[PDB]
Amino acid sequence: MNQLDQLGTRINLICNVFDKWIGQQDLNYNLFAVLYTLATEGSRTQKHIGEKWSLPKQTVSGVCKTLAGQGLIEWQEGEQDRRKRLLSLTETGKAYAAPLTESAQEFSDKVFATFGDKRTTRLFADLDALAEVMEKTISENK
Amino acid sequence: MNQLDQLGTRINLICNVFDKWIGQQDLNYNLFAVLYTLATEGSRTQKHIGEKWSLPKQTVSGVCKTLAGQGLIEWQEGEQDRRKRLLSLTETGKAYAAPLTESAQEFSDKVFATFGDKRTTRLFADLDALAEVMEKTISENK
């Protein structure tokens, strides 16, 4: 079949597999996007989390409501609107995310065993290049 | 930073951008899955479509009900349920699907013209391998 078809089926398969691993961590993709980013990158904005994990603002806002009510995250104080202020894991959040970061590193190590870092850097640059072409072609059509 | 993090963000971006392109045809992933499979492969069961595009059976049946009600698709006749029966584009469905296959083929030629076919093979093989290891590791972790 067509290359686009070959790509589309593949990426959808692999995203589903990644979501399945997240499910094993007793989370969903949306919760993971917030929890994992803050655990690994430190303090980040809702905008950043949403752009990183390709989620709309409302998705991120929703998950942040729930996590903040569970006392797991907090927004840094400031004059800016809440949504623009830096989000951070609380102490309970850090404890809650510790297992997640560990099991992520574990899964990451098994998973990339056959790849070198040279190969993966290139694969990641390939995916980026792929995304760029696709976005640019889409922009043209708009 | 982390390999898994780098992979997860990038596959979800491609998946997103693919969905965005589909949306620019004024469709969605679920409809595309049925319409595009049928237009390019011919007759297929709901199961084949569901497996190819990584969609649950309920989702597929729902979309098929809508398209049949619009006279765009049809089940062949037989002494089994329609869900295990061959799905076909009607005449009105083929005219309906024509512009979609054309824009898909146009998108595919524009994207992969930049990406290159040896590099496309490399991306596919790497994604295949990653998906393989990930599935196997998740299976073990149960």
Residue numbers in the entry:
A (entry chain B), B (entry chain A): 1 to 142
From the paper:
Neisseria meningitidis encodes two MarR-family repressors, NMB1853, a homologue of FarR found in N. gonorrhoeae which presumably also controls expression of the FarRAB efflux pump, and a second MarR, NMB1585, of unknown function. The proteins are homodimers comprising a largely helical dimerization domain linked to a DNA-binding domain that contains a winged helix–turn–helix motif. MarR proteins repress the activity of their target genes by binding as dimers to pseudopalindromic sequences in the −10 region of the regulated promoters. The repressor activity of MarR proteins is modulated by co-inducer binding, or in the case of OhrR oxidation of cysteines disrupting disulfide-bridge formation, both of which lead to a major rearrangement in the dimerization region such that the spacing of the DNA-binding domains is significantly altered, preventing DNA recognition.
The structure of NMB1585 was solved to a resolution of 2.1 Å by the multiple-wavelength anomalous dispersion method using seleno­methionine-substituted protein. Overall, the dimeric structure resembles those of other MarR proteins, with each subunit comprising a winged helix–turn–helix (wHtH) domain connected to an α-helical dimerization domain. The dimer interface is thus formed by a symmetrical interaction of the arm domains of the two monomers and involves contacts between both N-terminal and C-­terminal regions (approximately residues 1–25 and 110–142). The spacing of the recognition helices of the wHtH domain indicates that NMB1585 is pre-configured for DNA binding, with a putative inducer pocket that is largely occluded by the side chains of two aromatic residues (Tyr29 and Trp53). Thus, NMB1585 appears to be pre-configured for DNA binding, similar to the structures reported for the HucR regulator of D. radiodurans and a MarR-family protein from S. tokodaii. The residues in the recognition helix (α4) that are most likely to be involved in binding in the major groove of DNA are Gln58, Thr59 and Ser61. Overlaying of NMB1585 and MTH313 confirms the presence of a potential ligand-binding pocket in NMB1585 at a similar location to those in MTH313 and other MarR proteins. Therefore, in order for a ligand to bind into the binding pocket of NMB1585 a conformational change would have to occur in the protein so that the dimerization domain moved away from the DNA-binding domain. Interestingly, the addition of salicylate, a prototypical MarR ligand, did not affect the formation of the protein–DNA complexes, suggesting that the protein does not interact with salicylate, in contrast to E. coli MarR and MTH313. This may be explained by the occluded nature of the putative binding site observed in the crystal structure of NMB1585 and suggests that the protein may adopt this conformation in solution.
